[PDB]
């Protein structure tokens, strides 16, 4: 996976934060830590991410209803427990299959609104999707469509490699 500090720099930019925060790392898993303004500590990738979203005044990215907020947090958790818990190509195929089924009738993770869940799942899946064969990208067509859409969403991709899709 991307180092959390690298991911948080990406997110900051996507958000439009000026800014540059300094993140320390805690424990053996190098969990990111943010010295807040001001000034208790905030610890954990998705925790800090939701704080930056508020800081940027783009809280709609966290969901606009009770249901959407719950769904956003479910996919953020999924990102830090399921996606970051695998490597290479094995396990990942069950995951992709499930994600593929879920996205059959959805543009974004929550439905029709783009959220922080889409950003972080895209950052988290990039290392796997970039290694997919043409065959696999056709097998997981709904994942491909969602990923292709996010990677062109304004200011989200940055320096990350574009993945070739056809259409579709």
């Amino acid at each position: 996976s991307m180092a959390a500090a690298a991911e948080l720099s990406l997110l900051e930019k996507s958000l439009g934060l000026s800014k540059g925060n300094k993140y320390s790392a805690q424990g053996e898993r190098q969990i990111p830590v943010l010295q807040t303004n001001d000034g208790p500590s905030l610890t954990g990738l998705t925790t800090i991410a939701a704080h930056l979203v508020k800081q940027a005044n783009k809280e709609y990215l966290l969901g606009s209803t009770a249901e959407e907020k719950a769904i956003v947090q479910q996919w953020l958790e999924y990102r830090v427990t399921q996606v970051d818990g695998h490597s290479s190509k094995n396990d990942i195929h069950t995951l992709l299959k499930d994600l593929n089924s879920y996205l059959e009738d959805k543009v974004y993770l929550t439905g029709y609104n783009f959220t922080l869940a889409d950003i972080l799942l895209y950052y988290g899946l990039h290392r796997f999707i970039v290694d997919l064969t043409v065959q696999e990208k056709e097998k997981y067509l709904n994942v491909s469509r969602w990923f292709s859409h996010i990677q062109h969403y304004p200011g989200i991709r940055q320096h990350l490699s574009s993945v070739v899709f056809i259409k579709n």
Binding site: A70, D98, Y102
Partner: protein, 211 residues
């Protein structure tokens, strides 16, 4: 809405405790299903608890389900609560899973069980102690308390695994357990059987790392 639970699945503890928060906002139907039953259409492998929302979407994460119930009651997201829920997911659950493995699958006792969670328990105790409030983030129990109580209950319901030097933890845990929704949840999930009820679920789990 319909909430799907199963006997002896520990994840059903916090959701059952949280479900009352939906009162006056929506109706939660409770449905008991089998361990290998697949309720979520997009998930290959059986998963419980699951909440089928009135919109037809599914929540398959226990913490997200508890969050949704609290949000319906008017609760508002805060950083401290997110911090606790992320820690519960990524640091406590595997520590707890390992301890419960050694305890209910491999029949160990004492520090062979406690060893894998003492660090986590101590962290909770020290958080409660440095705060002057009785609950994790607030004057009254809230989302973080229910989620953490739900994860801890299958182990800490046995006093052998709640070290008394961790006095803040002990007080907090005992207080939550005696609240009515927590009492009802423990009865429904464990019935009367204590921790043994969990055995079948714990068998299927991956094994832990090292000592």
């Amino acid at each position: 809405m319909r909430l799907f639970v199963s006997d002896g699945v520990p994840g059903c503890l916090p959701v059952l405790a949280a479900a009352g928060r939906a009162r006056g906002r929506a109706e939660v139907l409770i449905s008991t299903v089998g361990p290998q039953d697949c309720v979520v259409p997009f998930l290959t492998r059986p998963k419980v608890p699951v909440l089928q929302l009135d919109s037809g979407n599914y929540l398959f994460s226990t913490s997200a389900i508890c969050r949704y119930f609290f949000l319906l009651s008017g609760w508002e997201q805060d950083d401290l609560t997110n911090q606790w829920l992320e820690w519960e997911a990524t640091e406590l659950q595997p520590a707890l899973s390992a301890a419960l493995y050694y305890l209910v699958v491999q029949g160990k006792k004492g520090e062979d069980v406690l060893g894998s969670v003492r660090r986590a328990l101590t962290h909770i105790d020290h958080s409660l102690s440095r705060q002057n409030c009785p609950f994790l983030a607030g004057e009254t129990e809230s989302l973080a308390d229910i989620v953490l109580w739900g994860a801890l209950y299958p182990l800490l319901q046995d006093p052998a695994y709640l070290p008394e030097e961790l006095s803040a933890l002990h007080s907090w845990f005992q207080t939550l357990s005696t609240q009515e929704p927590c009492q009802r949840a423990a009865q429904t999930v464990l019935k009367q059987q204590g921790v043994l009820a969990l055995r079948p679920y714990l068998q299927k789990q991956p094994q832990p790392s090292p000592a």
